[PDB]
From a paper:
Type IA topoisomerases (TopoIAs) are present in all living organisms. They resolve DNA/RNA catenanes, knots and supercoils by breaking and rejoining single-stranded DNA/RNA segments and allowing the passage of another nucleic acid segment through the break. Topoisomerase III-β (TOP3B), the only RNA topoisomerase in metazoans, promotes R-loop disassembly and translation of mRNAs. We present a series of cryo-EM structures of human TOP3B with its cofactor TDRD3 during cleavage and rejoining of DNA or RNA, thus elucidating the roles of divalent metal ions and key enzyme residues in each step of the catalytic cycle.
Yet, RNA complexes of TopoIA have not been previously visualized. We anticipated that exposing cTOP3B-K10M to elevated divalent cation concentrations, known to stimulate DNA and RNA rejoining, would arrest the mutant in a rejoining conformation. Using the same strategy, we obtained a DNA post-cleavage complex with wild-type cTOP3B, and generated DNA and RNA rejoining complexes with the rejoining-deficient mutant cTOP3B-K10M10 (detailed in the corresponding section). In addition, the presence of MnS2+ ion in both the DNA and RNA rejoining complexes underscoring its crucial role in repositioning the protein domains and nucleic acid ends for rejoining. The presence of MnS2+ in the DNA and RNA rejoining complexes suggests its essential role in aligning the cleaved DNA ends for re-ligation. Therefore, the enhanced RNA rejoining activity may relate to the ribose 2'-OH group adjacent to the nucleophile 3'-OH making it more susceptible to deprotonation.
Numbering used by the authors:
A (entry chain A): 0 to 611
B (entry chain B): 1 to 161
Write the structure that this text describes.
RNA sequence: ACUAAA
């Protein structure tokens, strides 16, 4: 009779990967209960004794928080009662997979448990959830002996996994408490508000009988960004301005467009004076000549924010569609995990191998083959926030195989990987300064020397320009014509989906996976409508809500509130505060907000009445 | 007697109107020019001062202005930036000074970068001009070589928020 | 029906 050790992973693909590693190619695979999960069995050594290893996976959160009993039927509970009186419980997630039963039957005879879950807050929460599931069935073990384990990993290479098995740690309770508090707050504050608003506005205005008005600490600020942009667009008064341009002819039909050093002057009389003090002269002198070699930096590693931002700007894709296509590519086995914050390649990575698989594609065969002969350049050091390695290809594909919208995403990802292991562009900058009367003019121009990573990413190419003539100080060039140009300051445009993602990440609103969902939710509720080249336009209903929130209480729509509450919840994670004191205090400050909202709800009625 | 005071003010470039300012400060042993400029510096040049600038600076007829003269600033505007955002790094700074002698208004333009004058200068300070200065299209052309700020406050508030 | 996050 040999002892057994049970391991849990966060997703079956990672389970299979860590099973293939660390077992030297020996596995016994079974599918038990649910069809998604699997059990991998093998033998080995642990704590100095022979042991059998059973390792399986749990698909995401086992359980989720929801209200208990009657306090979920909308017509029989007061919304204001949701803050403190309504109890909560962690019921289940995706009930069709009996995850609790599967874990119980799997850990029937296990003596140790090692958690291979992700190194993040949600990973810790799922760790404690599975742990609570499994302890009631485990063996009683012994006295002063340590049984629960946790492993820390960020890459799926052989050496890293073996090291992570060599050194083991312990979980922490404070992070799990922090995420539990976060879940409870986001449930109550937002369920109460949505229930009140939907019950109120449906019964007073008829055009929104079947619609749903929703509030939350993640989508309301997202709507607020677009409403602020619309306010700036509609509150803009254009100005008129004058720019003075000179054309200089050097040799025969060679004409150079000079640029004014003072780029713009906003006064008619001033522009007229400068024109009158320049137009008469027919001669020019050169003052300064410059020739400086500069470089264009290669792109960093690819994370999900960058992938969505480029897919929504160049590929004409939505965020949710892009992530669904990425997930399909990942589950087929062509892209490594498509939800990461990490932009730094692990030190022990097979960079050479992954670049070799692309050597037989006609699109970039020449560049890849050359790059392996002269050596690979080191990738740029970025941010390594644990989690999973950056998005990189794993297998060779041809357009006939993937086809359609799936192929366009594959090309950009695999062009990013080749670019990040290539050389920087080296372009020469030339400037010549002129003097036509008591004014200073300048001309620019760029010529490329080594294209570098421009070859695999054509759209980031230095534009082709002629070659500023080689002229030294004291050379004389006749002037052809000088004249003004009446220009007007253009007004900005509506926010693009690419720009919004930057604003979400800058203010800490949403995670790597909730960003696509929040953008889609505000589209489904008819708050915003997508139009033209992926531009978000506030709908008449959306404008009233955000404008109404400013009059009532601004810090329900202000972006900075989300970062503030996260800071307080982080204090629990460090252990320097208490779970109930922080949760209770934050509930109290928001509870009085609902009362001030309900008794002063007439503020939005004035704005809604005109627009319905 | 104030003949010496009149000669001193004429030489220095201050052009006070009459003996009203003389009678304003009639303290004993207080007939000194070097500290009679002190009170006039804060005193409103709109209220006090004579008319010796030409009649048609803005007409464009005149070309060059001679002699050192003290004048008062009224409004400051950055003509290289839009009104919505006064500050802007997209264009080099360029100021359109509005200047006065007490009765006649004039407009001056900054060419070269000046460290003494900025947007935050008090709306009532005094600047002294030395040497020959150029007038183009009725506008003064001020450079770093012919400007001397003298400070002073004329109890004009900010009137902005 | 809701909020959020794997
Ligand atoms: Mn995860
Ligand atoms: Mn994440």
């Amino acid at each position: 009779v040999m002892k057994t050790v049970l391991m849990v992973a966060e997703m079956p693909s990672l389970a299979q990967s860590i099973a293939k590693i660390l077992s030297r190619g020996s596995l016994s695979s079974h599918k038990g209960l649910n069809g998604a999960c699997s059990v991998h069995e093998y033998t080995g050594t642990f704590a100095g004794q022979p042991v059998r290893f059973k390792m399986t996976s749990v698909c995401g959160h086992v359980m989720t928080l929801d209200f208990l009993g009657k306090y979920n039927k909308w017509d029989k509970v007061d919304p204001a009662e949701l803050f403190s009186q309504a109890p909560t419980e962690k019921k289940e997630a995706n009930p069709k997979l009996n995850m609790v039963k599967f874990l119980q039957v799997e850990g029937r005879g296990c003596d140790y448990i090692v958690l291979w879950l992700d190194c993040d807050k949600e990973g810790e929460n799922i760790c404690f959830e599975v742990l609570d599931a499994v302890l009631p069935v485990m063996n009683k073990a012994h006295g002063g002996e340590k049984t629960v384990f946790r492993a820390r990993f960020s890459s799926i290479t052989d050496t890293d996994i073996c090291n992570a098995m060599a050194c083991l740690g312990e979980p922490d309770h404070n992070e799990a408490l922090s995420v539990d508090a976060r879940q409870e707050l986001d449930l109550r504050i937002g369920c109460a508000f949505t229930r009140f608003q939907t019950k109120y506005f449906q019964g007073k205005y008829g055009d929104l009988d079947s619609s749903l008005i929703s509030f939350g600490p993640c989508q309301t600020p997202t709507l607020g960004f677009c409403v602020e942009r619309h306010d700036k667009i509609q509150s803009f008064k254009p100005e008129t301005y004058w720019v003075l341009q000179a054309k200089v002819n050097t040799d025969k039909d060679r004409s150079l467009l000079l640029d004014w050093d003072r780029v713009r002057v906003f006064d008619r009389e001033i522009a007229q004076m400068f024109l009158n003090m320049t137009k008469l002269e027919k001669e020019a002198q050169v003052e300064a000549t410059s020739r400086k070699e500069k470089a264009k930096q290669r792109p960093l590693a690819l994370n999900t924010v960058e992938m969505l931002r480029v897919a929504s700007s160049s590929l004409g894709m939505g965020p949710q569609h892009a992530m669904q296509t990425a997930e399909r590519l990942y589950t087929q086995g062509y892209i490594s995990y498509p939800r990461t914050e990490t932009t730094h390649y692990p030190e022990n990575f097979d960079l050479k191998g992954s670049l070799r698989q692309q050597a037989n594609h006609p699109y970039w065969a020449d560049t890849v083959k050359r790059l392996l002969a002269e050596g690979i350049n080191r990738p740029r050091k970025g941010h390594d926030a644990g989690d999973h390695p950056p998005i990189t290809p794993m297998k060779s594909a041809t357009e006939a195989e993937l086809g359609g919208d799936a192929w366009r995403l594959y090309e950009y990802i695999t062009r990013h990987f080749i670019a990040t292991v290539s050389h920087d562009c080296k372009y020469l900058q030339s400037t010549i300064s002129f003097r036509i009367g008591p004014e200073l003019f300048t001309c620019s121009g760029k010529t490329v020397l080594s294209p570098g990573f421009t070859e695999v990413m054509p759209w980031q190419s230095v534009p082709l320009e002629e070659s500023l003539p080689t002229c030294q100080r004291g050379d004389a060039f006749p002037v052809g014509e000088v004249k003004m140009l009446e220009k007007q300051t253009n007004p900005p445009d509506y926010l693009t989906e690419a720009e919004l993602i930057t604003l979400m990440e800058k203010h800490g609103i949403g995670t790597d996976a909730s960003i696509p969902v929040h953008i889609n939710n505000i589209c489904q509720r008819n708050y915003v409508t997508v139009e033209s080249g992926r531009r978000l336009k506030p709908t008449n209903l959306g404008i009233v809500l955000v404008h109404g929130y400013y009059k009532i209480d601004a810090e329900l729509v202000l972006p900075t509130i989300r970062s503030a509450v996260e800071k307080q919840l982080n204090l629990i994670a460090q252990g320097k505060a208490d779970y109930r004191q922080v949760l209770g205090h934050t509930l109290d400050v928001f509870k009085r907000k609902f009362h001030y909202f309900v008794d002063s709800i007439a503020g939005m009625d004035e704005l809604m009445e005109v627009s319905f | 007697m104030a003949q010496v005071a009149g000669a001193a003010l004429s030489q220095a470039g201050w052009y006070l109107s009459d003996e009203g300012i003389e009678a304003c400060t009639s303290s004993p042993d207080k007939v000194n020019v070097n500290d009679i400029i002190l009170i006039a510096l804060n005193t409103d040049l709109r209220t006090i001062g004579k008319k010796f600038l030409p009649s048609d600076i803005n007409s464009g007829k005149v070309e060059k202005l001679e002699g050192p003269c003290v004048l008062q600033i009224q409004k400051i505007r950055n003509v290289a930036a839009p009104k919505d955002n006064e500050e802007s790094q997209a264009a080099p700074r360029m100021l359109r000074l509005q200047m006065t002698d007490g009765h006649i208004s004039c407009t001056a333009v900054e060419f070269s970068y000046m460290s003494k004058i900025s947007l935050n200068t008090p709306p009532g300070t005094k600047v002294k001009l030395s040497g020959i200065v150029d007038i183009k299209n009725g506008f003064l052309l001020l450079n770093d070589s012919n400007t001397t700020v003298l400070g002073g406050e004329v109890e004009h508030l900010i009137e902005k928020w």
